[PDB]
């Protein structure tokens, strides 16, 4: 209606959102932790997707209520924006299942896996709206003091993103016609860079590279490994040490 409808919606939103949403989301999370459960889905597969679709209908009712609600201030909440994207995507997959017919591949396809991880962040949002009460103040303070120093960690991760990209570029450049069957594309090159950054069989890289005819690629790889390892690990460790050390010096 108007402002009067908005005020009635606010009051009844408080009441019915405290009452109805909590119990239906608790039941949704119960049926979803029974859903995932890759032993009990065969003790099922017929009472599980039914409840999944029923509570997805409950969620689209939540979305309809939030749409008829105050609106722009609802959009101003990032968690509510995540819920809005989750429900647009959810009604998209629901109508995709509903229309049937179609002309693309199905029967547990890549799109089906996409809809499964879609149900996954739906379960995550169910958890995040269940945890409205009693998160416990000790870990409240721990999480706040952890999230206090965001600019330093973002700068450090950006600098190592640049360094990892540069090292991947030079390694792919120097590995041309030198058995790149492990890093034939940009994804596999950056994943091998992830392995060397995470200390995973880079000694094996050394042994099967000196099994090849190139030997000077090993000292370059080593010096890059040690410099980026020491610099990044030490910088992050010291940054978080001090980040909680000011909170230590305070009360």
């Amino acid at each position: 209606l108007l402002g009067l409808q908005q005020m009635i919606l606010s009051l009844t939103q408080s009441l019915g959102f405290e009452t109805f949403i909590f119990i239906v989301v608790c039941l949704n999370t119960v049926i979803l932790v029974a859903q995932t459960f890759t032993e009990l889905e065969i003790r099922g597969e017929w009472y599980f997707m039914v409840l999944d679709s029923i509570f997805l209908s409950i969620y689209v009712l939540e979305a309809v209520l939030k749409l008829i609600a105050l609106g722009l201030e609802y959009f101003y909440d990032p968690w509510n924006n995540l819920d809005f994207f989750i429900m647009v995507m959810a009604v998209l997959d629901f109508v995709l299942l509903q229309i049937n017919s179609l002309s693309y591949s199905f029967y547990n396809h890549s799109l089906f896996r996409i809809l499964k991880v879609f149900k996954s962040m739906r379960a995550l949002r169910a958890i995040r709206v269940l945890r409205r009460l009693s998160i416990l103040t000790s870990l409240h303070e721990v999480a706040g003091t952890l999230s206090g120093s965001l600019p330093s960690i973002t700068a450090i991760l950006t600098l190592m993103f640049t360094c990892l990209f540069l090292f991947s570029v030079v390694l792919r450049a120097l590995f041309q016609d030198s058995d790149p069957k492990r890093f034939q594309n940009i994804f596999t090159t950056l994943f091998t860079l992830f392995t060397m950054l995470t200390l995973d069989d880079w000694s094996l890289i050394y042994i099967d590279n000196r099994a090849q005819g190139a030997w000077y690629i090993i000292p370059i790889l080593m010096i890059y490994i040690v410099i980026q390892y020491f610099i990044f690990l030490n910088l992050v460790i010291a940054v978080l040490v001090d980040n909680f050390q000011m909170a230590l010096l305070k009360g």
Binding site: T38, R113, A123, S138, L139, T195, T198, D200
Partner: protein, 50 residues
């Protein structure tokens, strides 16, 4: 408390994992305790190229 927070984040990100897991790339991502502990091995971050 750090143990509790790490385990809770580990579970809520394993909900993402188990959607990819079971009956495909199996025998370490299946059974939901083996999957959790294999992801814990990958958290301990040594020799996951197998």
């Amino acid at each position: 408390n750090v143990m509790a927070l790490i385990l809770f984040f580990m579970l809520v990100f394993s909900v993402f994992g188990v959607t990819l897991f079971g009956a495909f790339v199996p025998k370490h991502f299946q059974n939901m305790g083996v999957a959790l502990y294999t992801l814990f091995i990958c958290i301990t971050q040594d020799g996951w190229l197998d």
